[PDB]
Enzyme design. Structure first.
Site, mmCIF file in Angstrom:
data_model
loop_
_atom_site.group_PDB
_atom_site.id
_atom_site.type_symbol
_atom_site.label_atom_id
_atom_site.label_comp_id
_atom_site.label_asym_id
_atom_site.label_seq_id
_atom_site.Cartn_x
_atom_site.Cartn_y
_atom_site.Cartn_z
ATOM 1 N N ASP A 107 0.858 -1.182 0.000
ATOM 2 C CA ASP A 107 0.000 0.000 0.000
ATOM 3 C C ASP A 107 0.908 1.252 0.000
ATOM 4 O OD1 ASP A 107 -2.325 1.757 0.358
ATOM 5 O OD2 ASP A 107 -3.363 -0.020 1.176
ATOM 6 N N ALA B 103 -8.008 -3.939 1.670
ATOM 7 C CA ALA B 103 -6.971 -4.811 2.221
ATOM 8 C C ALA B 103 -5.899 -5.154 1.170
ATOM 9 C CB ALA B 103 -7.613 -6.075 2.769
ATOM 10 N N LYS B 104 -6.161 -4.794 -0.088
ATOM 11 C CA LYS B 104 -5.180 -4.974 -1.184
ATOM 12 C C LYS B 104 -4.491 -6.337 -1.124
ATOM 13 C CE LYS B 104 -4.422 0.009 -2.014
ATOM 14 N NZ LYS B 104 -5.184 0.505 -0.804
ATOM 15 N N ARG B 105 -5.312 -7.387 -1.093
ATOM 16 C CA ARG B 105 -4.752 -8.754 -1.016
ATOM 17 C C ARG B 105 -4.441 -9.266 -2.406
ATOM 18 N NH1 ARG B 105 -4.462 -7.077 4.049
ATOM 19 N NH2 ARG B 105 -5.462 -8.472 5.621
#
Lengths: 285, 285
Positions: A107, B103-105
């Site tokens: 991120d 959550a940018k998984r």
């Protein structure tokens, strides 16, 4: 010459190099997915997750150089799964194993800093010796995690080259200078580690079953986390041919090849010792 | 015509389109970073995290179309932070707000499935209406999350174009067919959403402060999560010029522009209503 609780951990690259020399060149996944839990005769729930994780560290924590818990398999149970993950990582590190948190975070800015806060600072209940990170937002976006890792004596593994069918889609895309995305990440890491001895703290994830590694400069003076060990073409004896001179910097990660032998603690130990010895011997030859 | 607990949620794209029409076109971040907590006069700890999160949902949960909690700010407190996140998401959804889990998984195979298990299936204590995902490992690697999202009536937001200084490093890299990485992701999403009415469930993250969006086809028949609203050049009135015809599919995300007004619940409400109305008016013009 005094002790103090604030003393810094020695840099990750140095600690990792020593751990692989002392305990053998092996990282064991802690991968409590439903398949493995059912195979161990455990239920697919928090209690099963917890029994699996506890047994892995009890059996192997004093014997293996590195563990790699996969965060997703804990997160699927929410906060209670994360609580098992906290205990597992603490117990593993208390046993003297290094822990690479495989969470593939990525991120920007203070959000990146907050992930680093979670995994790379010593006061965190998820403090790990290294963290896997995804660089889709650009290498420079990882800066808060790089800086905090250096301060704590922790490291990172940046995704570079993976062996899933689709991994080339982004990784092979070409930038204006003619380097692809993967090569760009490797070059950033080489710069990050420049001059660090015996090994830098900033590594790459590079799949051991890939066939085109000879097209990349893996001489980055940092560790190469290599999933897939035990798979066809990525047996221990194959690693020197796959990685070339850089094989000395590989952190070979085995999951099923060790874990399928649980819950029997002697069987887990025997498998881990055998992988580490075979890899040691291949690299020595 | 019977009720049953197993009834499927209507598809995310349709539910999102309706929510923005009914409550106004706005997504409010739930971003309890240390800066904002100190600004609200709260401590930088789990108790502060919890008070912040509770107040945001109490003030806004019935009034805003969408919330976007940023997982990292909860994860920094370990399992206890994740427990606050669970409650926050549950309370938000109970109030009728959609929740986009930021959550940018991004991972592979059963690991990707396990992240989907955590966030995209209704029995999970982190069940959210959509999940942000990173496609560094390739669009096809997201398949387990795409399939489970369709089954649950949830959606995804795939990182495509971000406004951080380094975002172009990977996103602008060019594939063999001449499309860059971002354009490749947008095209995959357009194919994913083909024919879905009024809007598909598979969206992209596209930063509102970028200056080169005119070089991309944002007509993907899916939502465009646009961080940065309130920043220079990304005021509500600027959005139609930034996004073109696709502005109707934008989910405009505001963080500080609303959150800095806490802890005063009337001030939070007033700011959220004002952003939503200004965006509604700009898009209508």
């Amino acid at each position: 010459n005094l002790y103090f609780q604030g003393m810094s951990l020695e840099p990750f690259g140095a600690r990792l190099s020593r751990a692989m020399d002392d305990r053998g060149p092996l990282c064991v996944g802690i991968d409590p997915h439903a398949s493995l839990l059912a195979d161990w005769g455990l239920s697919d729930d928090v209690a099963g997750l917890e029994r699996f994780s506890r047994t892995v560290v009890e059996a192997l924590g004093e014997h293996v150089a590195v563990f790699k818990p996969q965060s997703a398999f804990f997160e699927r149970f929410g906060s209670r799964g994360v609580a098992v993950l906290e205990k597992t990582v603490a117990e593993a590190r208390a046993a003297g194993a290094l822990v690479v948190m495989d969470a593939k975070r990525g991120d920007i800015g203070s959000t990146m800093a907050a992930y680093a806060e979670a995994f790379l600072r010593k006061d965190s209940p998820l403090f790990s010796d290294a963290l896997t990170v995804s660089p889709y937002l650009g290498y420079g976006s990882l800066r808060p995690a790089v800086e905090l890792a250096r301060e704590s004596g922790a490291g990172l593994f940046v995704l570079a080259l993976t062996s899933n069918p689709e991994g080339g889609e982004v990784q092979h895309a070409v930038r204006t200078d003619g380097r692809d995305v993967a090569a760009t990440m490797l070059a950033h890491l080489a710069a990050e580690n420049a001059g660090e001895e015996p090994l830098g703290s900033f590594g790459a994830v590079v799949g051991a079953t890939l066939g085109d590694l000879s097209s990349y400069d893996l001489d980055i003076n940092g560790p190469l986390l290599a999933p897939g060990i035990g798979a066809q073409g990525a047996a221990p004896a194959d690693l020197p041919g796959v990685f070339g001179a850089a094989v000395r910097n590989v952190v070979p990660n085995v999951s099923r090849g060790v874990l399928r032998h649980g819950p029997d603690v002697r069987a887990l130990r025997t498998a881990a010792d055998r992988f580490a010895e075979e890899i040691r011997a291949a690299v020595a030859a």
